[model samples]
Target chain A: GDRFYDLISALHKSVRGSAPDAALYWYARILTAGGDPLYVARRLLAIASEDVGNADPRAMQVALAAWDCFTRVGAYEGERAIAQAIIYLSVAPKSNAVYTAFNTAKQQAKDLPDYDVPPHLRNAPTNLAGENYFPPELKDTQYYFPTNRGMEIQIKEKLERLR
Target chain B: GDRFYDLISALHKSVRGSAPDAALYWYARILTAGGDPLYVARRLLAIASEDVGNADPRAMQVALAAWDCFTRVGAYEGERAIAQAIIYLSVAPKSNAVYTAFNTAKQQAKDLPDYDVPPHLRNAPTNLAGENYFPPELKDTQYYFPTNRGMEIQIKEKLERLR
Candidate 1:
C-alpha cells in the first residue's frame, strides 16, 4: 500500500529542484496511489506562490486551473490536470523571495509590543457605538494599502518606520 | 533596516549549513524587531518541513501549534507562541531529506509524455463516461501510505511493484 514513497518523494524533490521529469514521476505515482487529486492540486497552488513566485505569475493561474479541474472531475480524472499544474510549477524559476521576505517580517515582529488598534481603522460596519470603538490614530495609520505598482510598497514603507 | 537582510540570509545559510546557533540568533533578531507574527509562524512551518523533517517529525506539530496560537490570538498577544516555535525549531535536529526528496522527484519527471489516465482511475461523473474509459489493472492502487512506524513503508512497496 505504501510502496510508492521513493517515486513520490522523487517527484516531489524533482519539482522542488526545478527538474521537470522527476516531479512528473511521483505525481503520477501519487495519482496511481489513489491520492486525492484536489490535495495534489492544492499543493500546486502552494508551490506556485511559494517556489515560482514572480518568476512566473501564470503559475498561480495554472494551479487554480488544476484546482478547477479537480473540482469538476471530482478527483479521479483530475490527476492528469493536476500533473499539468505540477509540471508548470516544476519548470518555473525558483525564487525564495516571498518566503524570505515573509520570514523576515515574522522575525521582526516577535518582540515588539502590539500597537493599539487605531480607532479609525476599526470596523465601522455596524453603526453600534462606532464613536467609542474607533481608536484615535487608527484612521491616519495606513497598514495594508497596496501600491499602484501592484506590490506591498505602501506596507513596506510603513514597516520601515519601525526601523 | 539592513539588518533584515543580513539576519534572514544568515538564518537561511545557517539552516543550509546545519548551524544551530546561526538559525537561533537570526530567529531571535526577527522576534526582537516586532515583525508580523505570521511571518515567524510560516518560517517555523518551513523550517520544520524543509530542515528538520524525518530527523524530528514532532517539530512540525510544534511549529504548527505555534502558528495556530498566533492565529487564534493575533499578534500583540501571540508573540510568546511565536517564540515557542522558534525555540523548538532551534533545537531540532536538521535534515535535508524533505528538500532532497522534493528536488529528486522533479528531476526524474522532466520528459514524461502526456500521461494517460488508466480507466478505473478515471473519473466518470456521468454514467456514460465511466462506461467508456479503460482503467489500468491497478487503477485503484494506493501508494505512499505513511505508517505509525515513522517511515514511508507503503511507498516503498508500491515502487517495488511499479518498477
Candidate 2:
C-alpha cells in the first residue's frame, strides 16, 4: 500500500518523540501485514541511542537486549520484549545534548587547523620522550564545552577539573 | 566568586538537560563554597522523576540512593555518589510526554462538565444500586486519548480494546 511507508515513517517519529501508542499501532499493523519485525527492531535500536542518547543510556542497553532476545527467542517473545523497551523509552527522559555536542565538535575539528597534541594528553613512549612533548601555547583551550543540560553538567565539571 | 546563585541556577538547568559536567562543577563549587549538598541532592530527586520520568526509572532510584549515601557517609563519599548519579542522568534518554499528558488531562477534567461514572467503572455498593449507576447519554465519549508517545501507546491500545 502507498500508505505503508508513510505509516512506518510516522511510527518512527512517534518513537523518537515519546509516542508509544502510535508507534506500537504501526508496529503491530506492519507486522500483521507481513512487514519485517527486524526492520522495526533495527529502528528501535537506532533511536534508543540516536534520539534518546544520554538522557537514558539504559535505553540502548535495553534495545540491544531486546534485539538479542528476538534473535534467540524468535518473533513472539522478542517482539514483546522490543515493545517493552520501546514503551519504556517513549516515557523516558530525553536529551539530544550529547548528539548535538558530538556533531559540533566534529565540525570544529574538521574546519580548524590541526594542532599538536598537548604534552599532558599525548602518549610518552619513553621517559625522555615525555620531556620533549609539546604543550599548546594556550593553557586553557577547551575543545568540547558541555551544554547546561541533563548529565553533561557533571561531565563538564570533571573535564574542567582534569584540565 | 559571588555569582553563586547564578551558578547554581545554571547547574540546575544543566542537570535537567544533559550536562553532567556543569552540574557537577556547580555541585562541588557550591559545597566547597559553603553551600549545602542536600539541596543539590533534593533537586536530583525531583529531576529524576520530573524530567527523566520512565525513560530512566532507575534515575530516581539512583538519586535516592545517592541521597541516602550522603546522609550516611557525609561529604567526601556522599558527594561523589550524587555526582555519579548526576552524570548517569546526563546521558540517559529523556521524555516529558507523561508530564505534559498529565497536565493536559488535569485541565480537561476541570474544564469539562462532571459526569456520573459509567456502570462498569463504578463500584456497586448493593445489588439494587446497579440500576442507578448512571450511564452516559452519549455512548462514545472519551475524555482521555493516549498519545502515540512512550508508554501511553500500550495504554492507548488497551483502552481502545476495553472501550
Candidate 3:
C-alpha cells in the first residue's frame, strides 16, 4: 500500500513538475501494479502542456514525439522515449502564462465591445472591395501592429493593414 | 511472430505514409494479436497531420476528436472512429506542409526570443498592474501563418502585414 501510494504520488508530481523519470518510475510502478502504459502516456501529454508551458514549449512536443515513437514501436521498445520525455520535463522550467491568458480571454470575451471593423479591413471576400473605405484615419492604425519580436510580428502587421 | 512484426511495421509505415489498405491490414493484424486500439488511434491522428494537411483539414482533427472521445470512454468505444480516421487519411490529398513546417520551425526557432507580450495585450487581471507588463513591440505578432491561397486566408491576411 505504501509503495503504491508513494509511486502514485511520485508519478503525479513528476507529471506535474514535468519530470519524465519520476513520471516513468511511477508509471512503471503502476504497470507493476497492473496499470495501462497507454493511459500513463496520455496523461503525460496533458501534463506536459499544463505544467510546462511557455517556460519549455517543447515539453508538449516531447510528449507528442514520444507518443509517435511509442505508437510505432509498441509497448516494449517505446519506453525509452517515454523515459527521455520524463527526464526532460522533470527539469524543464514552468509557466502559467498560457493557461492564465486562455482562461482570462475566454471569460472576458463575453461582453467585449464589438469594435467596428474599419472599412479597409472589412470583408473583401467578394469582387466589391473597399466600398466604405475610411482613408488616412485608419491607414496606420496602431491597435493591431505586430511587433518585430518573437512570433507576434507576422499577425500584427497583417491585422494593422487589415488584410 | 514474423507475421506479427511484418504486419506491425507495414501498418506503421502505411499509416505514416497515409496508405489506407496497408494500414488497415496491419491494424487488423495487431488487433487480432491483442494489440492496443488506442495506439492505432494515436497513429491515425499523427498521420492526419503528417500526410493529409490542408487537403483534408479534418483528418487530424477527426482523429484527435476520436482520440478524445475514446479517452473519455474507453478503447472499445473508439475503434470505429479510428477506422474512419484511417480511411480519411488514406483518401485525403497527402501533403507534408503542416508537419514539415512544424518540424522545421521547431528546429530553426530552437532559441526563441524572450520578448514580453505587448503591454496593451497583457491582461490587467489583478491589482498588480506593474509586474513587467507586456512590452509594446511584442503586441500582436502571430508566428505561423498559412498562405493566402488557402482556407486560412483570413489568418494569412493578418500575417501578411506582420512580415
In each prediction, how many residue pairs overlap at the backbone (N, C-alpha, C within less than 3 A)?
Answer: 53, 54, 16
Listed in order, each prediction's TM-score against the native is: 0.39, 0.44, 0.37
Ranking by TM-score: 2, 1, 3
- Give DockQ per model, in order: 0.04, 0.02, 0.02
lDDT of 3 by residue, A6-35 (tens): 666678687676555556667777878976
Q: C-alpha displacement of A157 in model 1, angstroms? A: 63
lDDT values, one for every candidate: 0.52, 0.60, 0.53
Off by over 4 Å in 2: A125-163, B1-163
Q: After superposition, how far is residue A40 of candidate 3 from its true place, in Å?
A: 1.7
Give the worst 10-residue stretch by lDDT in candidate 3 chain B. B125-134
| Model 2 per-residue lDDT tens digits across residues B4-106 | 7776777778887788888788777788788777777766655654566555545555766786788788877888898898897777766554344434433
lDDT tens per residue, model 1, A1-163: 3344333444555576654444555575565566666666666777776666655566677667545534533353245445545644654556655656576556545654555654454565432234433244333433232232223444446656842
- Candidate 3 at B42: error in angstroms? 20
Q: Would candidate 2 be rated incorrect, acceptable, medium or high by CAPRI criteria?
A: incorrect
| Model 3 lDDT per residue over B1-163, tens place | 5444444455556555534444444454456567788877766666667666665575566567556546643564455435444544543455666677787657644656665554444575433244343344444434344644334455456657755
